Amino acid sequence: MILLDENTKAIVQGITGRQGSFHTKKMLECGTKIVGGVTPGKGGQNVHGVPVFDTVKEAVKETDANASVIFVPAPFAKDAVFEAIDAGIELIVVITEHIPVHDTMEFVNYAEDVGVKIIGPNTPGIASPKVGKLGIIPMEVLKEGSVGMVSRSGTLTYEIAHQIKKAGFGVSTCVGIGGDPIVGLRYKEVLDLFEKDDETEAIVMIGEIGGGAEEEAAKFIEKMKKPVIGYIAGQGTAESKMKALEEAGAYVAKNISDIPKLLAGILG
């Protein structure tokens, strides 16, 4: 029951690509333990000091990596995820957008049976100020703290994170579950992980209209020990989600400005 922590040793698949190289630089800059990269035919090289391997198996061998962040283009992403799963990697963050849904369904199914954690696809990833990030989340809007954040949106999450930080609060772990129709870990799994994360004292759950992801997580919130603040953008409907969250015991923020106010009441 662990996501990103001090024991994380990650590899970057698609490390030589433009996006992979740039984000590897930014991940290194915030202290992320990136121990290797993978790009067929680039073995032996290095990107921003990180050693490149031709395959995940080779990379895992020399580094004992237990996590991977994937930037591989959509047509080749499924094979990259299977490669990471085949190699024993337990946490796989899939940044790539536009992966054919049947491809995603295949790797999400394989991973769940094996017990691997897939974050995404089409997600900015995960960020934990204390140890770094796996993905593209802007660390400028986060500072070390005890607020756990889970969302399935992009920009909105940063706007909210910005307001939270400006109000003086820090984040333990921020996780984006992804914006595609089929994804890996859902709200419930992330909330469960937050419940068992000593670094997390309060949770900010960000949703929006459409789907039933928030409604399904409401069931779990009912038995959670840690306080949950819920915010739904776009006020299946926003009202339906706010009602389900409120009935489950979550504290519903009507406006983003209410989130820091509730955190002040909960955390001081």
Curated annotation (Swiss-Prot):
Instruction: Give me the reactions it catalyses.
Output: succinate + ATP + CoA = succinyl-CoA + ADP + phosphate; GTP + succinate + CoA = succinyl-CoA + GDP + phosphate
Q: What does this gene product do?
A: Succinyl-CoA synthetase functions in the citric acid cycle (TCA), coupling the hydrolysis of succinyl-CoA to the synthesis of either ATP or GTP and thus represents the only step of substrate-level phosphorylation in the TCA. The alpha subunit of the enzyme binds the substrates coenzyme A and phosphate, while succinate binding and nucleotide specificity is provided by the beta subunit.
Name the source organism.
Methanocaldococcus jannaschii (strain ATCC 43067 / DSM 2661 / JAL-1 / JCM 10045 / NBRC 100440)
Q: Which InterPro entries match?
A: Cit_synth/succinyl-CoA_lig_AS (IPR017440), Citrt_syn/SCS-alpha_CS (IPR033847), CoA-bd (IPR003781), CoA_lig_alpha (IPR005810), NAD(P)-bd_dom_sf (IPR036291), SUCC_ACL_C (IPR005811), Succinyl-CoA_synth-like (IPR016102)
Task: Please state what the protein is called.
Answer: Succinate--CoA ligase [ADP-forming] subunit alpha
> Which residues bind CoA per the record?
T16, G17, R18, Q19, K42, I95, T96, E97
Instruction: Answer yes or no on keyword Ligase.
Output: yes
Q: What HAMAP family does this protein's entry cite?
A: Succ_CoA_alpha
Q: What subunit structure does UniProt give?
A: Heterotetramer of two alpha and two beta subunits.
Q: Say yes or no: keyword Ligase present.
A: yes
Identify the keywords attached in UniProt to this record, alphabetized.
Ligase, Nucleotide-binding, Tricarboxylic acid cycle
If you read the UniProt record, what top EC class would you report for this enzyme, in one word? ligase
Q: Which GO terms describe its molecular function?
A: nucleotide binding; succinate-CoA ligase (ADP-forming) activity; succinate-CoA ligase (GDP-forming) activity
Detail the disulphide connectivity of this chain as listed in its UniProt entry.
none
The top of its lineage is: Archaea, Methanobacteriati, Methanobacteriota, Methanomada group, Methanococci
The pathway to which it is assigned is: Carbohydrate metabolism; tricarboxylic acid cycle; succinate from succinyl-CoA (ligase route): step 1/1
The UniProt annotation places substrate binding at: Y158
| EC assignment | 6.2.1.5
